Amino acid sequence: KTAFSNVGRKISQRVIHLFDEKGNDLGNMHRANVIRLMDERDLRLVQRNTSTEPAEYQLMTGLQILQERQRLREMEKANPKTGPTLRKELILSSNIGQHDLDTKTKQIQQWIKKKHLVQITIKKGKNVDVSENEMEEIFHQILQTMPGIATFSSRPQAVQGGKALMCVLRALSKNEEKAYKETQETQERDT
RNA sequence: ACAUUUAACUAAAACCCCUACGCAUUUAUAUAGAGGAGACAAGUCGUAACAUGGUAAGUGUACUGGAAAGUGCACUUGGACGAACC
Ligand SMILES: [K+]
Ligand SMILES: [Mg+2]
Ligand SMILES: [Mg+2]
Ligand SMILES: [Mg+2]
Ligand SMILES: [Mg+2]
């Protein structure tokens, strides 16, 4: 998270690859020499590219710093590209009541619907002996509620010496969805 | 609706009406189904309250929500503010 704003007269790094306001490459210069050009022409320096190992800073007028972000405000509006995926977690118990399982199963539908990743964990019920046969039958029982909407990303594993099972769900991908749709029609319509 | 008749040298005889009660009305029981409260017990999800209970609590009202509840507006103390200046 950054913004196209002036860095000020406090530079952390001694050597900077300074750039002119008109786009000319002034070349690497000492940190002190950078501030002299900020006063001689009353200009503010903005870090254009952080990624490069050599520091890159461009000195431009305040009006030029307004037009720049005014364009980053349109490019993102025109073509927004926010793809981070949130991860949600649930920790159930083998002996979880159905009423609580329908409440937690409806919460997974809201997350899936928001393209989130739902990590579900199941643990042995309080002083209850149970294997992994019916302890893994809760995932299939939750996934069934979301037939086409959801699919496994990971699969059940013995996270803690078998006393727990962990799975991760995701919203079905567009292509996968279309494939599911196609299959659904054949079973009923063709018959 | 219904009618003064016979009789009368002692005096008597004769008498006999038709309409109501209902698909009205009162109350209660029984029955499909739905839903409360309580006892027993203390499974499931949380942790709402009691300590400034971890966002002080509560009243009334409104909206909202798996659930205790949450929030807004006004009100209360059945909260507090540490009690000389500095
Ligand atoms: K409260
Ligand atoms: Mg509490
Ligand atoms: Mg509280
Ligand atoms: Mg209140
Ligand atoms: Mg709310």
Please list the alpha-helical segments (H only) found in A79-119. 98-113
Q: CB–CB of A115/A171 below 8 Å?
A: yes
Rounded to whole angstroms, the Cα distance separating A93 from A96 reads 5
Secondary structure tally for chain A: helices H, strands E: 5, 9
Nucleotides of B under 7 A from a protein CB: 43-46, 66
Find residue A15's DSSP bridge partners. Answer: A30
Residue pointed to by tokens 């809760």 = A138
Tokens, residue A126: 């309080």
Q: CB–CB of A171/A149 below 8 Å?
A: yes
Q: What end-to-end distance do the CA atoms of chain A give, in Å?
A: 55
Residue pointed to by tokens 């002190």 = A32
Entry resolution (Å): 3.0
Find residue A90's DSSP bridge partners. Answer: A120
Method used to solve the structure: cryo-EM
Q: CB–CB of A167/A139 below 8 Å?
A: yes
Residue pointed to by tokens 């860095």 = A7
Separation of CA A111 and ligand 1 centre (Å)? 28
Tokens, residue A150: 């959801």
Rounded to whole angstroms, the Cα distance separating A132 from A117 reads 23
Q: CB–CB of A147/A113 below 8 Å?
A: no
Find residue A88's DSSP bridge partners. Answer: A118
Residues with CB under 7 A from strand B: A 91, 93, 95-97, 99-100, 103, 125-126
Å between CA of A144 and C1' of B47 = 31
A98 exposure class (CB count in 10 Å sphere: 0-12, 13-18, 19+): exposed
Nucleotide closest to A106 measured between CA and C1':
B66
Residue-level length of chain A: 191
CA distances from A17 to A24, A30, A59 (A): 11, 9, 11
